[model samples]
Target: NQLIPVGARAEVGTTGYGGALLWQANPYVGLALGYNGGDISWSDDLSINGTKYDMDMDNKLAYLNAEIRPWGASTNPWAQGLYVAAGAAYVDNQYDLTKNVGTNASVEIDGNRFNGGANGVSIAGNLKYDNDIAPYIGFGFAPKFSKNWGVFGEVGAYYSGNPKVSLASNNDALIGSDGRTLGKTLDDQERKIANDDKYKWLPVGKVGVNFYW
Candidate 1:
């Protein structure tokens, strides 16, 4: 079966994919340095705060962890299948928004507006987070070494601090220079971003095949 040896493992999937370099201290435990990546987008209006929002995201996560196969030292198929791990990760994520309506009408984010005035007012911007360091705890089940190669599945949870959002605008919307009002509005949006579920940690799941030699 293969995802790795005491040396390396490579995994690929629709939701996420990447590879890892590894070191096995014993049959029961090993340490793996890995990278995982992905992007998400949809050209549809996301109804938010009683209004509609056109939003999309690009996110990437990378990590390093210690993987323990509870009964890895044994040859029992069931015993070697369960695994647990603890680690740290870095996340690069972004969400962008603007107005087009596409048929629905228009949209706007808190302090930033973009829909009503076709007479020339056009605006756009984004909210993003760089979780440079986050901690994780997880467990999983790997495919059979019983046969040779089989698939695996995993689920994990992570904890991250709130991030700041970068609010901005352009076109006719910038015709006024109300700095005080704009600043307050921007501050409100940042709090909303922080509270949103998506802005939180990287709780991810994975499925792949393993070929161990």
Candidate 2:
């Protein structure tokens, strides 16, 4: 049961954001921009005829985003209320892959085993996410602590569209081949893995602190 090749998945997910409001323009409405970065890990383990092989994948990303928030009412700044916001984000992602086969294998592989290599092997190509628009609506209380500074807390969900992965180099070995490599040791297995799915979408949550000038 453990000899089956595992598919790609996500891990070590995180997001960072910062925002600024233009109180001079209008306290009720403001423009915001920020930066975000995170990492994801993927693994695949396969077993055939009592032999086992493993593969690991990882990706790092940085993104630029902007949003606009409109307050419910300006009469009572420190009252309970709700608002909505929508904006666009640009993401740059770096992807890597590593593989380890059983000794009773037939393929010969080289390059970085942990993060893949820069040559012959392609980790990513023109990494871009089409649906980068994230919109959110939230309700919270704007508790005023001082004249220039106040604390605002809200709970909301944003639309984080699926990201895509493109292989740099296509493996010709995988074409028209049945399990050819068969050996006795874990280091004897030879195989090359490639990306099957082009894109994946997932949900994200957001929480932040707001400051006024």
Candidate 3:
């Protein structure tokens, strides 16, 4: 049976959850436009500047990529449906850090310690990336199983760029024993750690079902 020229797809993976529209011009070549985005939020303990805080990490991303399938004309069935995908996206990935201090609680920063004052104190911080528009590249497969429907999948990397850190306290009186503000002591030290442990590539894996008309 002959297949239709247009198709639709839906899928889930490291890029969250989204879908794509496909067009097959001939047996030798095809093209697709897709969009994906979601949020993976969790809580954990994070140490910054020798102090531990409750960290809530929110991983969110939305992207669009144009994909090309170049091997659809192959005589070998297994060799068809191979494609190269590349595109750009909007990224809003960050970390939320907090440490609450009781009225009589003790707090420590960069080897210095202090007692919590009236109304208590709270410290807030965040970790962010420099890039808002991330680029992606990968290979994929989307072969027809019947005259109208099929499956597709891919594994690749999305560039996230470099990391940045910010730290702050609700009370301005909360300075370190080292004659520095809490933000300075924490931000400076944590920034170096993030710099030293740079992870630029975000790995992505996706799989889904496709329907043709």
Candidate 4:
């Protein structure tokens, strides 16, 4: 494998970023050619429609982009101005429904019991989106491109549309009396979670300090 493959014998030092995020950048000829990924854990207690869900989440992200310094050129301070890029990104963000431990053992979703099967039946599982790829565009500002040492920040969004959700369950659900099963609880929540597929756009915003070379 080739270690240093540059278009013109220049690299990270020339307006690119090299940080713990592997969060590479090129504030000048702004670009990165590969995917950098990581996992972020988050949790919360949410209430909706007279129901509550203690949620635990694993937020996953991988990004790659090619961009340019629109507000500046190679040697001018302006060269470090307005950096914009376009690329595809991956999002496998998923979350699961949980209980409140001793305080609250279970919750109800749509008039259905979503708990341990003590009273006839119950259902529980994670909700996920298989939507993997989306187009991304962002804009940021840098102050130095020739020296490769500066901090930059940007805000942007990805166009993913709404991806259908997948249900992962370890259910011992009892089939309902009118053509529904305990698993249908998932269906009910699934529809609610999707919210009619209203929000497919994932917002991306970042600030970075680069000291390349």
Question: Which candidate, 1 or 2, would have the higher lDDT against the true structure?
Answer: 1
Q: What is the per-residue lDDT of model 2 for residues 79-169, given as tens digits with 9 covering 90 to 100? A: 4233444444444434344333334333332331221123222222223344445443334344435555544444433433444443332
lDDT of 2: 0.35
Question: In model 4, which range of ten residues has the least summed lDDT?
Answer: 8-17
**lDDT per residue, candidate 3, 1-213, as tens digits?**
233348778987755677877766577555556766554434445544434457565555666665665766676657777788788666666666787766766787767665566665778877675467888788888765587788888987777765566777777566666777665666665766466634566677889998888
**Candidate 2 regions with alpha-carbon error over 4 angstroms:** 1-14, 17-24, 38-71, 74-81, 93-145, 154-160, 165-202
Minimal lDDT window, size 10, model 2: 1-10
In candidate 3, which residue pairs clash? none
Each model's backbone clash number? 7, 22, 0, 4
* TM-score, one value per model: 0.56, 0.36, 0.55, 0.49
Q: For each candidate, what is the lDDT?
A: 0.61, 0.35, 0.68, 0.51
User: Model 1 over residues 69-142: C-alpha lDDT tens digits?
Assistant: 97886678677878898888886656566543333234444634434434433235575657778887889787
**Residue range with the least summed lDDT across 10 consecutive positions in model 3:** 41-50
Alpha carbon deviation, residue 108, candidate 3 (Å):
25
- Which of candidates 1 and 4 reaches a greater lDDT? 1
| TM-score-better candidate, 1 vs 2 | 1
